[PDB]
Amino acid sequence: YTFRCLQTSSFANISWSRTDSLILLGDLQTHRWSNDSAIISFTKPWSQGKLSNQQWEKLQHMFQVYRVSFTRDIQELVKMMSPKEDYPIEIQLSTGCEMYPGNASESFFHVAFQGKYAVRFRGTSWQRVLGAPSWLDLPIKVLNADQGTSATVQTLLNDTWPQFARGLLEAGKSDLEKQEKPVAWLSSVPSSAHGHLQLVCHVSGFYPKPVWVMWMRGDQEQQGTHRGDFLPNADETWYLQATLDVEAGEEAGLACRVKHSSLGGQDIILYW
Amino acid sequence: QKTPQIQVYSRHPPENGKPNILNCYVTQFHPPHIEIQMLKNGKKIPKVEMSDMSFSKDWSFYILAHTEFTPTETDTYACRVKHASMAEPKTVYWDRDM
Numbered sequence: 001y002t003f004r005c006l007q008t009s010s011f012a013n014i015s016w017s018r019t020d021s022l023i024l025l026g027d028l029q030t031h032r033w034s035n036d037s038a039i040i041s042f043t044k045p046w047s048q049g050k051l052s053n054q055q056w057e058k059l060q061h062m063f064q065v066y067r068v069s070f071t072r073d074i075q076e077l078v079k080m081m082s083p084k085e086d087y088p089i090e091i092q093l094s095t096g097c098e099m100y101p102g103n104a105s106e107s108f109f110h111v112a113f114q115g116k117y118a119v120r121f122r123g124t125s126w127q128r129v130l131g132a133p134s135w136l137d138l139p140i141k142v143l144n145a146d147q148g149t150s151a152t153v154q155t156l157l158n159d160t161w162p163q164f165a166r167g168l169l170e171a172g173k174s175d176l177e178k179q180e181k182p183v184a185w186l187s188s189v190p191s192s193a194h195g196h197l198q199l200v201c202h203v204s205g206f207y208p209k210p211v212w213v214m215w216m217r218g219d220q221e222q223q224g225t226h227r228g229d230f231l232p233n234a235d236e237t238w239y240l241q242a243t244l245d246v247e248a249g250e251e252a253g254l255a256c257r258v259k260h261s262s263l264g265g266q267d268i269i270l271y272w
Numbered sequence: 273q274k275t276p277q278i279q280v281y282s283r284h285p286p287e288n289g290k291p292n293i294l295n296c297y298v299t300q301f302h303p304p305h306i307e308i309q310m311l312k313n314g315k316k317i318p319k320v321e322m323s324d325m326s327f328s329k330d331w332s333f334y335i336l337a338h339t340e341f342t343p344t345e346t347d348t349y350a351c352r353v354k355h356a357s358m359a360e361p362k363t364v365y366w367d368r369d370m
């Protein structure tokens with residue numbers, strides 16, 4: 001399970017900006033924070049984790065001070081060095097920790113600039129990453145001078161994230177382990193070849209994410225089964241489709257088999 | 273700049289006359305400024321819910337638009353996206369068979 005605070009910031013000019021953020025624990029959204037909103041909203045009944053209301057308020061206050069200070073800094077950093085193209089500026093922040101079994105965790109603070117991975121935080125300082133424009137070295141040097149901010153980021157990565165995230169993981173364990181059953185249905189589309197058909201197995205509403213979907217001829221797995229990408233549902237269950245290219249007449253006797261943790265061992269076997 | 277990929281799919285098996293939810297998953301676009309519309313017979317559906325703008329490990333933006341719909345034999349459904357990476361809006365029609 002990865003705990004991650006994702007921030008999307010847009011600087012249109014020297015005055016206009018908007019920053020929007022959310023928090024995810026695994027594939028479940030736990031918090032929301034829009035630009036116009038002054039307070040962070042819970043999107044789950046367990047989003048406070050194991051924090052007391054006084055502990056949550058101190059964490060929220062830190063974020064409130066940070067959002068104004070971030071906006072102010074990027075603005076200052078841009079004004080102090082006109083980088084030929086001052087605006088528009090697109091910033092993506094990803095900070096949190098990867099949760100490993102046994103109270104162990106690995107914290108991170110990564111930054112993308114204009115859609116590309118630009119900066120990281122390691123030890124006590126910000127480091128430009130391979131590929132980021134070299135002129136970013138100057139604002140990175142300015143930012144690194146502030147030992148106070150650097151100590152907060154150290155506190156955040158070493159104390160705030162691993163402790164808040166473990167508590168969040170504990171309070172959200174039953175939700176992250178709830179079993180939702182997949183429902184399967186079949187269809188076909190004529191393929192770009194005469195006497196060729198594409199068989200589609202649609203699988204939706206399952207939770208957790210790990211699933212197995214295969215087109216079969218009895219006990220024989222059809223190697224030609226192509227798994228699509230995992231597509232979200234609004235209720236945070238998953239959707240997936242697996243396709244198979246066949247010659248006309250070869251559909252008869254084919255089945256879609258789906259193995260999911262919510263079905264026990266009773267696999268869905270859906271014949272064409 | 274990155275061009276948006278669009279995928280239109282339903283929550284439940286589609287059955288004519290049975291209420292359902294139509295999904296439109298827009299991904300791989302940069303920058304995050306985007307206009308997403310869901311259409312029924314080319315006309316904009318008024319009740320469309322959007323998830324909060326989020327991104328993947330590889331910084332690829334993603335958003336899910338969804339709406340309540342009742343599939344029919346004569347109605348067409350679509351998801352139209354307008355993004356600066358494209359000269360024209362991209363419309364992808366719901367095909368229950370794909």
Ligand SMILES: CCCCCCCCCCCCCCCCCC(=O)O[C@H](COC(=O)CCCCCCCCC)COP(=O)(O)O
Pocket residue numbers: 005006007021062063065066067069070072073074077078081083093095111113118119126136139143146149152153156
């Ligand atoms: C010319 C181009 C523009 C430069 C682009 C360079 C890329 C960005 C470099 C890396 C991103 C750094 C993030 C900025 C953090 C600055 C926050 C700050 O200013 O710190 C504290 C306030 O922040 C805090 O409370 C601690 C920071 C923790 C942030 C955690 C929240 C992130 C999760 C959404 C107050 O300092 P000042 O008085 O100088 O304003």
Ligand SMILES: *[C@@H]1O[C@H](CO)[C@@H](O[C@@H]2O[C@H](CO)[C@@H](O)[C@H](O)[C@H]2NC(C)=O)[C@H](O)[C@H]1NC(C)=O
Pocket residue numbers: 122123124151154155158
């Ligand atoms: C947070 O944890 C990091 C380790 O990831 C600590 O980093 C060390 O900091 C000292 C200076 O204070 C450096 O000389 C070491 O080289 C750092 N270690 C590594 C592995 O880079 C950091 O000090 C901790 N900060 C707080 C305030 O707890």
Ligand SMILES: *[C@@H]1O[C@H](CO)[C@@H](O)[C@H](O)[C@H]1NC(C)=O
Pocket residue numbers: 016017018019035036
């Ligand atoms: C974002 O919020 C800040 C603080 O409330 C405000 O000054 C700024 O104008 C807002 N930006 C937009 C585009 O809403």
